[PDB]
A = this chain, B = another copy of it.
Amino acid sequence: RTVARDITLLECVGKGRYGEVWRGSWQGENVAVKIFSSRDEKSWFRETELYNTVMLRHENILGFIASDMTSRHSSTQLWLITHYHEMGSLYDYLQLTTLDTVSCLRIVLSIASGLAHLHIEIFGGKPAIAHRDLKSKNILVKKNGQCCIADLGLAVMHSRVGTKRYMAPEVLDETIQVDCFDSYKRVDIWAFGLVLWEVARRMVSNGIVEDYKPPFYDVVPNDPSFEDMRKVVCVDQQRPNIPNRWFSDPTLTSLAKLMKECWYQNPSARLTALRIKKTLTKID
């Protein structure tokens, strides 16, 4: 049989130190192609190893298609091929979109759903998985209004470091209990609470909305250092601001309480992804 492997790379939709992401075409159909820098080869290996261990299939996890290694003259080319989400990242989407109650809740419940699926061990099944770099740039918006979680290059399985702005206090003060898998789930919950805050700001109530800002925009520089973050989160124990206007709106009042229970200094006090889902299903 003919094994058609040609992919037409059509447009670059992302360039960073990680490498590049392209909109590509396979057999008439959009795919996303991440081309890894040599600097970030271990992210390709880790995601490939995870998918070789468990073929995750979930509506709120970016859909895996292929891992490709090609020999070149004097280098190795590493590609990850996934589903393509033309609306782009949640970070992108929140810059110039505002939300209503239904669309805000749908976004955050879909993220909680994907995260709880990563976190749960299923016997028969899947290992428990922690993401370790959850943030709004690693979430994609689907046309049906739900999101999906992307980038398992730092993920850990039970049975590069995270983005500093989203690091939990125990990561910044190096007290994280690295031999306890639940430690990594609790780091993801902290980061989820920050994402919840980013999204909730863009939800309109009584004709008011906040501008898009990243977590801690008001207390750290762009590209904050590890020390900048440690002083804010660990030493001074700051948390993102909850605007007064949220307390006039029942949805944002509930969401403020939820994000507070993701930001406890004590990791074991934080909500689980399953508890977050249940709470979000009881809002509105």
Contacts and interface: CB of A to CB of B under 8 A. Distances in A.
A6 B5 CA distance: 5
Nearest to A44: B52
Contacts of A33: 3
Contact of A66 (B41, B49, B52, B69): B69
Contacts of A7: 2-3, 5
Interface stretch (A72-80, A93-101, A132-140): A72-80
Contact of A41 (B9, B42, B52, B72): B52
Contact of A9 (B3, B45, B55, B71): B3
Given A3-B9, A6-B5, A71 B76 contact: no
Bin the interface of chain A by size. 35 or more
Count copies of this chain in the complex: 2
B52 A45 contact: yes
Contacts of A45: 48-49, 52
A38 to B, nearest CB: 10
A10 to B, nearest CB: 10
A70 interface: yes
A227 interface: no
Nearest to A78: B52
Contacts of A71: 51, 55, 64-66
A69 B41 contact: no
A4 interface: yes
Contact of A69 (B6, B24, B48, B73): B48
Nearest to A79: B3
Contact of A54 (B6, B54, B75): B75
A6 B9 contact: no
A67 interface: yes
A257 interface: no
Contact of A1 (B9, B42, B48): B9
A6 B8 contact: no
A143 interface: no
B70 A69 contact: no
Given A1-B9, A5-B70, A51-B76, 10 more contacts: A2-B7, A4-B6, A41-B52, A44-B52, A45-B48, A54-B74, A54-B75, A55-B71, A64-B71, A66-B69
13 contacts: A1-B9, A3-B24, A5-B68, A5-B70, A6-B6, A41-B53, A45-B52, A48-B48, A51-B76, A54-B74, A54-B76, A66-B71, A67-B69
Give the 6 A-B CB pairs with smallest separation, nearest first.
Answer: A5-B5, A67-B69, A3-B7, A66-B70, A5-B6, A41-B52
